[PDB]
Amino acid sequence: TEFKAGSAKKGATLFKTECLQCHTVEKGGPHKVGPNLHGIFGRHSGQAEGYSYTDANIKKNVLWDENNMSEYLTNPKKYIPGTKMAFGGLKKEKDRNDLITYLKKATE
Ligand SMILES: O=S(=O)(O)c1cc2c(O)c(c1)Cc1cc(S(=O)(=O)O)cc(c1O)Cc1cc(S(=O)(=O)O)cc(c1O)Cc1cc(S(=O)(=O)O)cc(c1O)C2
Ligand code: HEC
Description:
By secondary structure, this protein is an all-alpha fold. The chain is built from 5 helices and no strands.
């Protein structure tokens, strides 16, 4: 995948509709169905403190960046078979770029 910097404004809306159900982004924010996402970029997968992950999410051991995040969010179970993230994916390229542009800011 080839991430291109988009609109964090549009991305914030996408996060609210597609992700917020299962995730928070703020430092010190709570785990929900899914892990809090603060500090995700530049950290290996399956490491949010206090959250119990699948073996698949831990053993993937991917250093998250904008490009591999874009592949993951296209089709989560295809990138990490055995995941328990029940999200089908964002099939539209502009949606992935906008979402990731937001996530880079919101998880810092
Ligand atoms: O910065 S903005 O988010 O406000 C913006 C709005 C519009 C834009 O046309 C663009 C930016 C430029 C643009 C960027 C990209 S990116 O490189 O992926 O970031 C892609 C496109 C684009 O026009 C092409 C494009 C793709 C899609 S997709 O099917 O979802 O992948 C939809 C659209 C595209 O133009 C339609 C579209 C949606 C939107 S939306 O408000 O985000 O829904 C704004 C604008 C649009 O032209 C009108
Ligand atoms: C619940 C129904 C979810 C929705 C909707 C989304 N996510 Fe999720 N995510 C969820 C779980 C249960 C998990 C852990 C999965 C496991 O196998 O253990 C995740 C994981 C992620 C990750 C990886 C985190 C890590 O520390 O490696 C990311 C980056 C992630 N989720 C992001 C994300 C985004 C951006 C979403 C909206 C598009 C989204 N998720 C939806 C549960 C759920």
